[PDB]
């Protein structure tokens, strides 16, 4: 496993559309026993990344090798995708023949899931203007009116009651996401141990 | 990857504390012309993904490695690394630098942000501090920190408004700010015409930036 070790810090690796808006919560609302170490990773590296020793924790999303059984999971949250634009109307259609899409990568939890809802969906055309892993990234090239993204509603709540963002489909075009934590199911620190009894205790208020 | 073409798409691997900051202003002058595949990389990763087919463009900081044939580089901007922290609500710093062991938020040891800064800590031996977090994106240490979890060190452009506002104080204005460069590399080899044409556009833009 990793040589890097100490008592207290809690080595983690969040997937490139989560860290921004989960971690700031959790080591707010932590009691401060830890050390943080946080690295951004692909939903694909999380597997190896556990069983390497590389990292304590993953924080990603539903993924289906690591809810099987040498792992265990608390699921963090579950969100909603809504497509949404910039400028009090949408500055794009749906309906639009090829409009600027501003998409997550191929190899994301989440971009996956967008490329299949827009595969089943043939009345879609589009054109991807834009990707990136990053939902803030994302977030701000939306904002700046250069196209469609689909996002979280967690990290798009102020700007859809703000007015800045506007969603444009509430029924079929919405994708549910569900946010974990991953973990080796056999027994690490007693910080380790700390640091999971209490991210359980802290996952009704995330 | 390499197989990966369309007609516009212009790849892109951008450093981790560099990556949020630089894009959108790039996206919104660069004539739209373009298709845009950006993915966070360290910096150790830009001349494996520059040799190979993995990235056309790196959006990086000065690194020797690069700046010498086979690649060509541009200079975008540069920029100076502050020591913040949160206000304690009265208008004055939450933390000091001259706290024993005060907490540290600090990018990875990888980053050459981190390099940059460990050195600096390094040169100060006054200063006693205790790493509490770590991370390379630059935002993320930004948000830890006006939450009020310790000092980092940010660059002026991801804190400019949390700077005006207050949310942030900066605590030295002298010896412990650090000068960063930002470039963009290539290989020294001709590419795509459109590629080309996204070199050359982007250079018309690096002193507006
Ligand atoms: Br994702
Ligand atoms: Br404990
Ligand atoms: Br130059
Ligand atoms: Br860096």
Redesign the pocket.
């Given at each position: 496993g990793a040589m890097d070790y100490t008592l207290r810090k809690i080595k983690i690796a969040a997937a490139h559309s989560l860290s921004l808006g989960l971690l700031p919560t959790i080591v707010k609302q932590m009691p401060t026993?830890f050390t943080y170490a946080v690295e951004a990773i692909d939903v694909d590296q999380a597997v190896d990344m556990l069983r390497e020793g590389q990292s304590d924790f993953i924080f990603s999303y539903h993924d289906e090798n690591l809810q099987q059984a040498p792992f265990d999971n608390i699921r963090l949250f579950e969100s909603r995708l809504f497509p949404v634009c910039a400028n009090g109307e949408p500055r794009y259609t749906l309906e639009q023949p090829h409009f600027p899409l501003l998409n997550y990568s191929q190899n994301s939890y989440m971009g996956r899931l967008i490329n299949r809802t827009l595969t089943r969906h043939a009345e879609l055309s589009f054109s991807t203007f834009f990707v990136s892993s990053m939902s803030e990234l994302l977030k701000q090239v939306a904002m700046d009116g250069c196209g469609i993204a689909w996002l979280p509603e967690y990290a798009i709540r102020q700007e859809i009651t703000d007015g800045r963002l506007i969603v444009l489909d509430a029924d079929e075009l919405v994708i549910p996401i569900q946010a974990y934590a991953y973990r080796m199911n056999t027994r690490m620190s007693?910080?380790a141990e700390?640091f999971w009894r209490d991210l359980r205790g802290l996952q009704a208020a995330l």
């Open positions: 026993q007693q910080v700390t």
